[PDB]
Amino acid sequence: FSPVPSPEGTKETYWETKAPSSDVLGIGAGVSSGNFAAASVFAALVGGYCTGQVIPLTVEPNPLFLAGSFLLPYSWALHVAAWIQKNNGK
Amino acid sequence: MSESVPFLKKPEALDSSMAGYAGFDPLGLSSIADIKFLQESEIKHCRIAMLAAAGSIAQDIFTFPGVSKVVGTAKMTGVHDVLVKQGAMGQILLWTSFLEVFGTIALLETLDGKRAPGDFKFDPLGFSKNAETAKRYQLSEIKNGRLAMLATGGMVHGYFITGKGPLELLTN
Amino acid sequence: DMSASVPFLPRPAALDGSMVGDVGFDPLGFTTKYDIKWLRESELKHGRVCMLASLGCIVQEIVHLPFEATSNPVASEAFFQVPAGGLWQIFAGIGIVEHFSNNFKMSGSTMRAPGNLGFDPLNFGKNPSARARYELAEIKNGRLAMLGFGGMIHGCFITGKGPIGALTSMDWHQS
Ligand code: CLA
Ligand code: CLA
Ligand SMILES: CC1=C(C#C/C(C)=C/C=C/C(C)=C/C=C/C=C(C)/C=C/C=C(\C)C#CC2=C(C)C[C@@H](O)CC2(C)C)C(C)(C)C[C@H](O)C1
Ligand SMILES: CC1=C(C#C/C(C)=C/C=C/C(C)=C/C=C/C=C(C)/C=C/C=C(\C)C#CC2=C(C)C[C@@H](O)CC2(C)C)C(C)(C)C[C@H](O)C1
Ligand SMILES: CC1=C(C#C/C(C)=C/C=C/C(C)=C/C=C/C=C(C)/C=C/C=C(\C)C#CC2=C(C)C[C@@H](O)CC2(C)C)C(C)(C)C[C@H](O)C1
Ligand SMILES: CC1=C(C#C/C(C)=C/C=C/C(C)=C/C=C/C=C(C)/C=C/C=C(C)/C=C/C2=C(C)CCCC2(C)C)C(C)(C)C[C@H](O)C1
Secondary structure (H helix, E strand, O other), rough: OOOOOOOOOOOOOOOOOOOOHHHHHHHHOOOOOHHHHHHHHHHHHHHHHHOOOOOOOOOOOOOHHHHHHHHHHHHHHHHHHHHHHOOOOO | OOOOOOOOOOOOOOOOOOOOOOEEEEOOOOHOOOHHHHHHHHHHHHHHHHHHHHHHHHHHHHOOHHHHHOOOOOOOOOHHHHHHHHEEEHHHHHHHHHHHHHHHHHHHHHHOOOOOOOOOOOOOOOOOOOOOOHHHHHHHHHHHHHHHHHHHHHHHHHHHOOOHHHHHHHOO | EEOOOOOOOOOOOOOOOOOOOOOOOOOOOHHHHHHHHHHHHHHHHHHHHHHHHHHHHHHHHHHHOOOOOOOOHHHHHHHOOOOOOHHHHHHHHHHHHHHHHHHHHHHHHHHHOOOOOOOOOOOOOOOOOOOOHHHHHHEEEEEEEEHHHHHHHHHHOOOOHHHEEEHHHHOOOOO
């Protein structure tokens, strides 16, 4: 009804192709599909290892293993970005 | 290809004009983040580390009058704990934070592209008016800072293992 | 172009070099957000209070009335010792003076010249060439006073001995 504002740098992201344009990756638009795939596996293994090392949680958990455990969900987003980049030819 | 690493491709974001360019970015971190931000951060890390490495050696060589009572034996990281209890560390933090607030404004100007990164126009004694000497001095600053970053980590880890401190460990 | 005080940062647009006591020092750009005349009026008002206050703190330690509770050598401690009725009298007087000075005008209403209340019982500045140097003097001495009064008031909180006693008797040879 009036112009709806968006932050500067807003671009069009609507896609009907096989994979979205690399712009949907934000700052990761230039990273290669191999680099996301290797980061995906690396984050999955390190995150799973760190998660496993603190499954019986104590009052003294290792903070590096807590922080490293956040790599498991981050790896999901990494392999999605790897599929997007492989299907954009990157 | 890259001058540093022959097998890998040349990093796209990095250019020869920028000081301390070896074409070294195998993981391509320069693509992910704005290069101007990375340049400003690298220079800042270099200067803090340079002060840190010189200070680490200096504290072994000599200590300021009256400091010895407050710091009984602790060196490197250990001194910080005692001076944190006393007022030294807090007063340094306060004045550095005040400097950084203006540094935040400077960082914004560098990110916009208006101002060259890492330059605060601080040349109290003229050393870079030649415009040929300036570039050599800039390369010297980058290389010395990189060495000091590596050195600061190297020294502190030796303190962690033995507690000797940089010069004492070399003697024994 | 670029601020003289802060070399790296660009010059604030609002200043223009016109105002007295300007060296280009507005890194955080308060001037863009707020009216320059109101900002300067606040700066002068803050400084004038501080100049009087700093002289007062030193004088309160050095001199006392022949009365109890006005004999305290610590500025803050004396504020507690002195009767509330007197503090109320001053506060009411200051409020009446603000009403008197502005002819009942608020920030929008007040904006006249910046800080030029025009109270001149003795006109030191008869010459226009000599004046603007009295302007410059006032702003620089007031800024110094604001920092000094704060420095003194906190020293009174910490040492508790008053300004001159604290300065001469620095803690010496103890942790
Ligand atoms: C990252 C840097 C860093 C850090 C965190 C510390 C931290 C500390 N030092 Mg070390 N120190 C440093 C650098 C550093 N120092 C440097 C560069 C030197 C000279 C080579 C020293 C020499 C030194 C001695 C001799 C002693 C300490 C001591 C201490 C402790 C008490 C604070 C004090 O009195 O320092 C005082 C330190 C200084 C006055 C030196 C600062 C000099 C640098 C070059 C500042 C330069 C500012 C620059 C000119 C302005 C640039 C402006 C620009 C950014 C725009 C504290 C843990 C004391 C201690 O407990 O020792 C066991 C002590 O006795 N320092
Ligand atoms: C911001 C300024 C300021 C503030 C908030 C105070 C506040 C205070 N003063 Mg201080 N004082 C000041 C400035 C200030 N003074 C100045 C500038 C002087 C002269 C150098 C003095 C001299 C002074 C003395 C001698 C004493 C106090 C005392 C006191 C306290 C008790 C009130 C009292 O008995 O007043 C009494 C005040 C007087 C007897 C005379 C005050 C005359 C004024 C403040 C000086 C002239 C100001 C200026 C010309 C005003 C222009 C007005 C114009 C805008 C119309 C009170 C907390 C008393 C105290 O407890 O001492 C520890 C006390 O004995 N004051
Ligand atoms: C003049 C002035 C200026 C200025 C300035 C300043 C303050 C300039 C200072 C620059 C400095 C402080 C440079 C210091 C670099 C230190 C290095 C490279 C460390 C090497 C150590 C190594 C390799 C090691 C090691 C060790 C290991 C790890 C473990 C130990 O057990 C053993 C051992 C010790 C061997 C500027 C530019 C601001 C402007 C203007 O012009 C005015
Ligand atoms: C300009 C600039 C910026 C800045 C900045 C800075 C440094 C700003 C500093 C501002 C300061 C320090 C202001 C101080 C105000 C103090 C006052 C009004 C006290 C008055 C005294 C009173 C009320 C009293 C009294 C008393 C008396 C005398 C005696 C006692 O018995 C009783 C009592 C205790 C009641 C930044 C960097 C942010 C960026 C920006 O882009 C440009
Ligand atoms: C204008 C004009 C006239 C007028 C007038 C007037 C009222 C003029 C009065 C001007 C005054 C009172 C100026 C005083 C400023 C105070 C300063 C600069 C001190 C700063 C403190 C420092 C540096 C400090 C400190 C300290 C620290 C922090 C800690 C301490 O332990 C120790 C230590 C002491 C070292 C009138 C109205 C009559 C009419 C005329 O027609 C026009
Ligand atoms: C904790 C704590 C504190 C502290 C503290 C401090 C000062 C902590 C600082 C820690 C630092 C600076 C660690 C840096 C490590 C550098 C590394 C691992 C790089 C190695 C190089 C590599 C892997 C490869 C290099 C390479 C080679 C060999 C070949 C390839 C090329 C190249 C890249 C050159 C305090 C002060 C609060 C006290 C408190 O009581 C405790």
